[PDB]
C-alpha cells in the first residue's frame, strides 16, 4: 500500500485547493481522481476553432476573493464578460432591450409585483444564517414548501411568476417545484443576494479566466506531479484500523492518517464504507441530487449582435425556447465570436434525445429571432456539454435540496466521520455551488485536518479572505421607491 499523510478524493477545484494547502504545509498528499482528467465540473476544451472554451464552470466576479487569489497565485488573469451594449428580455415573441441588471416592466401593477418579488427574496434571506440555514426562524415552514409554492403565493402577475421561474431554473438548474424554498433562499443569500447573484457587471458573471477555468485544477496538478492519480475512482474506505485505508477501482490501496472527500455529496454513494456511515449521512447522500444543464456555445465570424447595440445577453421567457439565458462568450480580442446558452432543467432532459446538429439548428433559429438577425443562422462552429451524462459529477452546476431535506439532514454535510473531512463547493458558506465555494470548502477541510494534527489552533479553521485588488466589489444599493413601494396585496389592502 502507498502511504501518505492525507488522501483527497476528487481532483476538482475543491480537492486541488485542499491538497495544495496541505502540501504547502509540508504534508504528503495523494489526490485520487476517478476521470482521465482534473477539473470536475470545470472543463476547458482546446482546439483551433475555439482556441479554448469553458464547457463547465467559467464565471467569477467581485466578492469571490478565494478563487481570484488562488487563480492569481497560479498565474491566471481575468477578462470582463461583454456587457457594454444592451441586454435583451424576450417576452411574448418580442425583444425588449434594457440596461441595468433587472429586466424592467412598464405596467404599474406588474412593476409593484416584480419589485416586491426581488425585495422579498432578500428580506427572507436576511433571516437565514449562511453557515446554518436550518436555524432560520421559519426554517421548517420554508423547507416544507417548494419554490413553486412560494412563487404561487408571492406573484400576483404571470409576468413576475414567469421571470421568477426563469430565475430559479437559471440559478439552480432545477424546476421551482423540485427545490425547497428555504434552500433556494439560502442559496441566493449566501451569494450576497439577488443583485449580486444575477449581475454580470459587479456580480457573479462579471469575468472569465484567460485560457479557461480548467487551468486552476490543471496548474495545481502541475505543482503536485504524480501525487495526482488519474483514473483512480475510489470504491472503498476502511476506518476500522490505525491508519485509514482507501481503495481504488484498479485495486490500488492508499494508507493515510486522514481523508478529504472533495466530491459532490451524493457521489459518496459510489464508495463502500467500513464501518457503515452514521445513519444521518447514510440517508443524506441519497437525498441530494444535482441539477440538469447543457452548456452550448455557438461560434460566428463576428460578434454581430454588437452592431445593433446588443451585448449578447438574452433573457428568454416561456416553455418553447430551448435556451432561457445567454452571454457573449467572445474572447477579449473581439475574436472567436460566440454566444454561450444554457438549456435548463427539464429542457436539458427533453432536448437530450435530439442530435448535436438538431440542437445547433434550434439555438441558431432562437438567436436569430431574439437578436433579430439572420447572421445567427450562419454558425462557423458549435461546442456543447450535457452535464446530466457525467457518472462522476451527477449533473451541474451543483446539488439542490428537495423540500424537507435541508432542515432534517443539512447539519450532516460538513460533519467529520472519524478521519474523513468534507470539502466540495456544497459545504461552502459563501458562493456554495461556485468555484469560489470549492476553494472555501477545500481550504477549510484542509485546515480542520491541520487542527486535528495540533498544527494550528481552532480559530484558524475558518479564515476571512482579503478583497481582490483586481476585482473590487462595489456596494449593492436600492432606491427609496424599491424599499417602500407596496406589494400588489399591499396596494389592494389600501383600497
- Interface with ligand SKB by CB under 6 A: which residues? 59, 102-103, 163, 166-167, 170-171, 197-198, 204-205, 315, 397
From ligand SKB, ligand C15, ligand FAD, none, interface partner of 398 (C-beta below 5 to 8 A by class): ligand FAD
Counting residues that bind ligand FAD (by CB under 6 A) gives 42
Secondary structure class of 293 (helix, strand, coil): strand
Rounded Cα–Cα distance for residues 158 and 89 (Å): 15
For 377, the grid coordinates are 443562422
Please, what is the minimum distance in Å from the beta carbon of residue 490 to ligand C15? Answer: 10
Give me the least distance between CB of 375 and ligand FAD, in Å please: 26
Phi, psi at 273, each rounded to 5°: -105, 135
Return the DSSP state at 272: E
Told to check if 142 binds ligand C15 by CB under 6 A, we report no
Q: Which residues bind a second copy (CB under 8 A)?
A: 143-146, 148-149, 175, 177-178, 233, 235-236, 249, 251, 266-267, 269-270, 272-273, 276-277, 279-280, 282-283, 286-290, 292, 346, 349, 352, 386, 388-391, 394-395, 402-405, 408-409
Query: Cα(2)–Cα(254) distance, rounded to whole angstroms?
Result: 5
Of 101-109, 149-157, 232-240, 364-372: span binding ligand C15 (CB under 6 A): 149-157
In angstroms, what is the minimal distance from the CB of 140 to ligand C15?
A: 18
Distance of closest approach, residue 432 Cβ to ligand FAD, in angstroms = 8
Q: Smallest gap, in angstroms, from Cβ of residue 390 to a second copy? A: 7
Residue that has been written with the C-alpha cell 423540500 in this structure: 403
SS3 389: helix
E strands within 398-470?
420-422
CA–CA separation, 27 and 5 (whole Å)? 6
Q: Which of 50, 56, 115, 388 binds ligand FAD (CB under 6 A)?
A: 56
Whether 146 contacts 177, CB under 8 Å: yes
Nearest to 439 by CA among 16, 1, 9: 16
Site residues (CB under 6 A) for ligand FAD, limited to 276-295: 293, 295
Alpha-carbon span 117 to 111, nearest angstrom: 10
Site for ligand FAD in 331-390 (CB under 6 A): 387
The nearest distance, CB 408 to a second copy, in angstroms, is 6
Site residues for ligand C15, 155-174, by CB under 6 A, read: 156
- Distance from C-alpha of 294 to C-alpha of 111, rounded to nearest angstrom: 32
Q: What DSSP element (H or E) covers 385?
A: strand 381-386
CB 323 within 8 A of CB 363: yes
To ligand C15, the closest distance from the beta carbon of 149 in angstroms equals 10
CA distances to 19, 54, 359 from 209, rounded to whole Å, are: 22, 9, 27
275 vs 489, which CB is nearer to ligand C15?
Answer: 489
Which of a second copy, ligand C15, ligand SKB, none binds 168 (CB below 5-8 Å, type-dependent)?
Answer: none
Amino acid at each position: 500500500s502507498n502511504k501518505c499523510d492525507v488522501v483527497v478524493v476528487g481532483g476538482g477545484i475543491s480537492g486541488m485547493a485542499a491538497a495544495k494547502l496541505l502540501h504547502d504545509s509540508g504534508l504528503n498528499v495523494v489526490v485520487l481522481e476517478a476521470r482521465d482528467r482534473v477539473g470536475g465540473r470545470t472543463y476547458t476544451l482546446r482546439n483551433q476553432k475555439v482556441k479554448y472554451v469553458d464547457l463547465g464552470g467559467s464565471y467569477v466576479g467581485p466578492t469571490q476573493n478565494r478563487i481570484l487569489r488562488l487563480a492569481k497565485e497560479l498565474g491566471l488573469e481575468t477578462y470582463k464578460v461583454n456587457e457594454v451594449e444592451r441586454l435583451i428580455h424576450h417576452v411574448k415573441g418580442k425583444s425588449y432591450p434594457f440596461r441595468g441588471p433587472f429586466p424592467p416592466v412598464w405596467n404599474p401593477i406588474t412593476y409593484l409585483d416584480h419589485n416586491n418579488f426581488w425585495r422579498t427574496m432578500d428580506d427572507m434571506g436576511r433571516e437565514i444564517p449562511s453557515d446554518a440555514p436550518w436555524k432560520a426562524p421559519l426554517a421548517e415552514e420554508w423547507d416544507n414548501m417548494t419554490m413553486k409554492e412560494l412563487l404561487d403565493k408571492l406573484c400576483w402577475t404571470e409576468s413576475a411568476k414567469q421571470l421568477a421561474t426563469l430565475f430559479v431554473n437559471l440559478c439552480v438548474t432545477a424546476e421551482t417545484h423540485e427545490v425547497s424554498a428555504l434552500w433556494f433562499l439560502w442559496y441566493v443569500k449566501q451569494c450576497g443576494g439577488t443583485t449580486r447573484i444575477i449581475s454580470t457587471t459587479n456580480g457573479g458573471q462579471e469575468r472569465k479566466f484567460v485560457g479557461g477555468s480548467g487551468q486552476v485544477s490543471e496548474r495545481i496538478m502541475d505543482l503536485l506531479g504524480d501525487r495526482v492519480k488519474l483514473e483512480r475512482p475510489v470504491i472503498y474506505i476502511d476506518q476500522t484500523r490505525e491508519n485509514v485505508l482507501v481503495e481504488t477501482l484498479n485495486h490500488e490501496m492508499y494508507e493515510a492518517k486522514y481523508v478529504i472527500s472533495a466530491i459532490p455529496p451524493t457521489l459518496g454513494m459510489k464508495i463502500h464504507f467500513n464501518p457503515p456511515l452514521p445513519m444521518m449521512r447514510n440517508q443524506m447522500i441519497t437525498r441530494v441530487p444535482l441539477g440538469s444543464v447543457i452548456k452550448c456555445i455557438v461560434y460566428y465570424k463576428e460578434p454581430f449582435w454588437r452592431k445593433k447595440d446588443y451585448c449578447g445577453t438574452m433573457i428568454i421567457d416561456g416553455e418553447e425556447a430551448p435556451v432561457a439565458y445567454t452571454l457573449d462568450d467572445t474572447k477579449p480580442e473581439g475574436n472567436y465570436a460566440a454566444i454561450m446558452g444554457f438549456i435548463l432543467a427539464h429542457k436539458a432532459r427533453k432536448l437530450a434525445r435530439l442530435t448535436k446538429e438538431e440542437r445547433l439548428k434550434k439555438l441558431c433559429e432562437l438567436y436569430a429571432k431574439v437578436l433579430g438577425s439572420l447572421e445567427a443562422l450562419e454558425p462557423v462552429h458549435y461546442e456543447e456539454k450535457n452535464w446530466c451524462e457525467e457518472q462522476y459529477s451527477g449533473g451541474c452546476y451543483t446539488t439542490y435540496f428537495p423540500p424537507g431535506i435541508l432542515t432534517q439532514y443539512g447539519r450532516v454535510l460538513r460533519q467529520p466521520v472519524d478521519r474523513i473531512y468534507f470539502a466540495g463547493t456544497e459545504t461552502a458558506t459563501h458562493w456554495s455551488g461556485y468555484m469560489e465555494g470549492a476553494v472555501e470548502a477545500g481550504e477549510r477541510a484542509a485546515r480542520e485536518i491541520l487542527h486535528a494534527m495540533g498544527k494550528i489552533p481552532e480559530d484558524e479553521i475558518w479564515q476571512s479572505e482579503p478583497e481582490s485588488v483586481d476585482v473590487p466589489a462595489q456596494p449593492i444599493t436600492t432606491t427609496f421607491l424599491e424599499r417602500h413601494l407596496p406589494s400588489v396585496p399591499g396596494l389592494l389592502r389600501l383600497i
